[PDB]
Structure 1
């Protein structure tokens, strides 16, 4: 339509309505029904969603010919007297054109590129005691008394929503707050196409660049983050050409200037991996280090009961909140199977609330960083949160026994706190202690419990060793002469610890080392 803004179909049409459609188009109801038009728009959002790119381009749709972009703290850099002077010379050229020509253009655009630098009045009623609050209210006195019944438009944008005072967020001052969030899958295919427009019209690069395949593999990150995939991608194609021949500098147009491949993109999201946030992108290989093998027949019967219950989250309307529990012996593979079921849902918000990121926190800050994860799962539609390793969030120890009662009573409630209306949430829990959770009345809160047992037979013990591929078939036959006819019971995380302790010995001594360690 214009210089590209993608994934804001429901939002660029929203600022069509409130400011753009009135005061210019019809104009008969404007001149019949004497109207007050809106004064400007406040732009919420995480960094990287084109808040500037609207205001860089909203002064470039009707070609109003007067854009006025001021910077954030650009006013304040004078001393007293002249501090107030810049905003009353900023509105002045549009206030002067409120003339005997009172209507009819009508100088529109006034842009504060980050307005919370000036307009705080945050509620703690402080901060230099008002060199800014003499240009906060001087800004407010310029729009009401004297009235600007005009075409002016004060588009100020920000990142912190609440810290601008609501006396400036009243409808006479500024009403239209607009949450400009990170785009979805449909939003990201709109926005890969813009930066890959000129390269699409460059040489038909390699035809394996599928922006639908790049929409799904890039699942979280926003617009400016998504441009940074491209600026590394076409830069990767340069050092495909400018350093393979010579060093700094020599080579210049030696290979008939080359093409952006799919192999450049997949290396461009190995570097950079980081979406920033990192919501749904933890790179959970730290939680699943050695894959998910089907060592036992119950293993499929664990992770199907996940997706037999994931469909309850996707489809239902009776039960909007699902709280499952993956229990069992320790080292049995509960955290690993919790990440796989959380991955196979393909939800748009998959967060692993896990105590490996919460160490050293006091009894209180574990409640806040569990509140924060269970806030950002309410701000979606489908979301799975793995409340991992219950007896570490509860920081339990069986001497006494002691545990944080502040966290437990912030965790018995979040298993029953439903999300807002129409929204869904899946809670996967892992514990090695069912009987401890039976005392604290948490099995009452969890909906159903999935048992993850250890290995049960020697036939499961051989099959657990088959798929890993660490012993020879004659060595497995020696184990089959041993572990068949015996009772074995050991976890799978421990069973990876045993094999790596056994492979460090001499080849005549590895099997007898493994039989000693398995004996416990």
Structure 2
């Protein structure tokens, strides 16, 4: 009763583990007794005790779920005191339990009768203590489920004679209500299914297919609910409610994702006028007196309409563009603010602002009363692409000009990172190639009416057009590779096989894992060993939609701030894709390093250190590959803690390797090969592959008589100690 210090132990049997009752020794306690376990002054838990012979005296056994819930570790000391329940008040009437599958491997869609679950729960856990938030394992029909206690209610008085409590005792007449966990696939049937937190929003029943817009549902619903929802009720009711119509919307996103359509389409949902486009940079016209004059001229029609009709005119719209440039000029911003907000302003206007830079936008222009509803439009996912392709290819499918071989799902799966404006371009390209298929125009432009029937667009037409017409923006850079990997890849020994093999064991992890959304690797080796040419050969085989190379040659003469901005921009662009891979090479030159001093740019180093440890937004993945030649210098600056792993690309260090590489290059004949083998089989070799190629090219210039002599002399001169 006072309390004794026991030791935690492991559950002896599975049956007792499912009972949710801590196992104790008979010499210490008795079955059915409830105790309180103390792990700290502020940590107390209540458990039901069961007696098993295998439990050593002086110790208490807990199942794995109990240890995790109570934060217990095997072997740690706890204090146990007998606990008495006040059945007059602690008796429990009803439960609300969140039930979810214990194991993901055994998830099934079969229905489960909650009424039987409650009966089994009562039949098993009768006269047992339970607390809010307790996690346990419940077995039903030879199936394991994870149960979490959500609510507890007191029992009503007996007939002869719903308080919320934190802990109580379960009895035979207690009731259990089961609710599936969030996003749970568990199917529950019966009357024991009452749940809570049932709050949502009801929206009008739209038909997106008939519109033209696909893949943008939540944004459309939210915008309609928050901006235009209060311009259709009669003017009498709005006056009674006292609402004030919104006067601004700011939609931002990449270029060409449906931003303007999302406004034009909703424009005609309500009897109203048509938007008057106004370019962002066009309003910047040289001198004042023209910019202001035009700005005034923008609202003349609205002012005249309001004067004529007062509070009965139709709504107008002004589709802005590149508001970033017009704001930060200041005169225009002040004029617009006065026109929209202040004392003299119109009540039949609604400015829609668009931009690409969300951060550069000014702060004073974003505040309740001004532009308030800020929304983002992102790239479409698989479902969006499917719907877009369905909608954009309806007219052709209606006339029976689409072959049965075309599968929309395959095209949607293949097309990755397409913005949506290009999806339209793909269909046009397919139609164009299909039409060109049948143009028998030799000699003179003519028409082949013989095969003009069924001017279809077969899978070949789509695929043939997907490689020579459309170039996605956030897509593969297919021109850089031709300049880096200039002479293929030659397997001159075991090392090349190993390094490339690693290129897989990492590239796969970044694609099939969720606990590590960022990986890094630093390739390094002696100079002229072929480092920069082994990173592209991995990034290409990685099969990633987005690839880039942040070489230092494109920035010559730049100052520190310019380099920092360029690197930040490259990384920001890379952040916006579902997958990516960014290659940064020749790190030593980025830092602007020189052995005297030493000297280097203290800002680029800090920027690089910060960037290599910043995870992207949720659900996206990244991979960074480095390349360096001076490892000790990088270790002095404490930079190898940022990188997760490193690899060592070796150099040609055996005569066999030299002979085999020369053979694979296929330049010399058999006699010269034998002579070189005889002459070089008594000395050590230390030469880079690039140096070997350059030496071979240099030596091939001599006459046939003295090619071998010149090559051997050059190799002897180049040879040096490791």
Query: TM-score by structure 2 length?
Result: 0.56
| 1:334–1:267 CA distance, 2 compared to 1 (3 A) | farther
Aligned ranges for residues 212-227 of structure 1 at < 5 Å?
214-215=411-412, 219-227=416-424
Contact 2:546 2:580 in 1 (8 A): yes
Tell me, what secondary structure is at the counterpart of 1:342? helix
Rg larger for:
2
Structure 1 residues 211-270: Cα deviation after superposition (integer angstroms, max 9, x where no partner): 555556654452334444444554445555558524679999995585556666666566
Does structure 2 conserve the Cα–Cα contact (< 8 Å) formed by 1:475 and 1:511?
yes
Note if contact 1:328-1:453 (Cα within 8 Å) is conserved in structure 2: yes
- SS of corresponding position for 2:351: strand
* Shift, 1:327, TM fit: 0.9
110 and 417 in structure 1: CA distance in 2 versus 1, 3 angstrom threshold: closer
C-alpha contact 2:303 2:346 (8 A) present in aligned 1 = no
Gaps of 5+ in 2: 1-208, 717-722
- The 1:343/1:20 distance shift into structure 2, 3 A limit, reads farther
Tell me if the contact between 1:325 and 1:450 (Cα under 8 Å) persists in the aligned partners. Answer: yes
Distance in 1 of aligned mates of 2:242 and 2:417: 46
How big is the shift at 1:63?
A: 5.3
CA 1:271/1:280 → structure 2, altered by over 3 Å: closer, same or farther? closer
Secondary structure class of the residue paired with 2:506: helix
Contact 1:97 1:107 in 2 (8 A): no
Specify the SS of the correspondent of 1:426.
Answer: strand
Q: Take 2:287 and 2:637, find their aligned partners in 1: how far apart are those partners?
A: 63
Whole-Å separation in 2 of the counterparts to 1:192 and 1:475: 63
Matched, 1:468 2:665: yes
Please state how far the C-alpha of 1:393 moved relative to its aligned partner. 1.6
Q: Which moved more, 1:490-499 or 1:32-41?
A: 490-499
Instruction: Point out the more displaced range, 400-409 or 165-174.
Output: 400-409
C-alpha distance in structure 2 between counterparts of 1:218 and 1:276, whole Å:
13
* 2:475–2:546 Cα contact (<8 Å) kept: no
1:153-193 residue CA offsets vs partner (Å, 9 max, x unmatched): 32232345466644433231211233334445554444444
Higher mean Cα deviation, 16-25 or 507-516? 507-516
Write the mapping of 1:294-443 to structure 2, written as runs, cut at 5 A.
Answer: 294-310=491-507, 313-314=510-511, 321-347=518-544, 349-379=546-576, 382-398=579-595, 402-417=599-614, 419=616, 424-443=621-640
Q: Which residues of 2 match residues 59-458 of structure 1 at below 5 A?
A: 59-62=267-270, 64=272, 67-69=275-277, 106-107=314-315, 109-112=317-320, 115=323, 136-144=333-341, 152-161=349-358, 165-184=362-381, 187-201=384-398, 204=401, 214-215=411-412, 219-237=416-434, 240=437, 244-246=441-443, 258=455, 260=457, 268=465, 271-272=468-469, 274-276=471-473, 283-292=480-489, 294-310=491-507, 313-314=510-511, 321-347=518-544, 349-379=546-576, 382-398=579-595, 402-417=599-614, 419=616, 424-457=621-654
Separation in 2 of the partners of 1:408 and 1:75?
A: 41
Residue 326 of structure 1 deviates from its aligned partner by: 0.6
Distance 1:516 1:218, change over 3 A: farther
Larger strand fraction of residues: 2
Q: Distance in 1 between matches of 2:709 and 2:409?
A: 54
Q: What is the distance in 1 between the residues matched to 2:611 and 2:358?
A: 26
Larger RCO (alpha carbons 8 Å, 6+ apart): 1
Q: Does 1:15 align with 2:223?
A: yes
Q: Equivalents in 2 of 1:26, 1:484: separation in Å?
A: 99
Q: TM-score, normalised by structure 1?
A: 0.73
24-33 vs 154-163, which deviates more? Answer: 24-33
Task: Return the alpha-carbon distance in structure 2 between the equivalents of residues 476 and 184 of structure 1.
Answer: 58
Q: Per-residue CA shift, 1:131-170, capped at 9, x if unaligned?
A: x766655544444456889675322323454666444332
Query: Are 2:593 and 2:600, in contact at CA under 8 Å, matched by a contact in 1?
Result: yes
Q: Indicate the RMSD between aligned Cα atoms, in angstroms.
A: 5.1
Bigger drift between 426-435 and 197-206 goes to: 197-206
* Larger mean Cα displacement after TM superposition, 325-334 or 257-266: 257-266
More displaced, 327-336 or 422-431? 422-431
- In structure 2, the CA distance between the partners of 1:149 and 1:287, relative to structure 1 (3 Å rule), is same
Match of 1:126 in 2: none
1:201–1:455 Cα change, 3 Å: farther
Whether 1:496 aligns to 2:704 is no
Contact kept? 2:474, 2:546, Cα under 8 Å: no
Name the stretch that deviates more: 330-339 or 276-285.
276-285
Q: CA deviation at 1:450?
A: 0.6
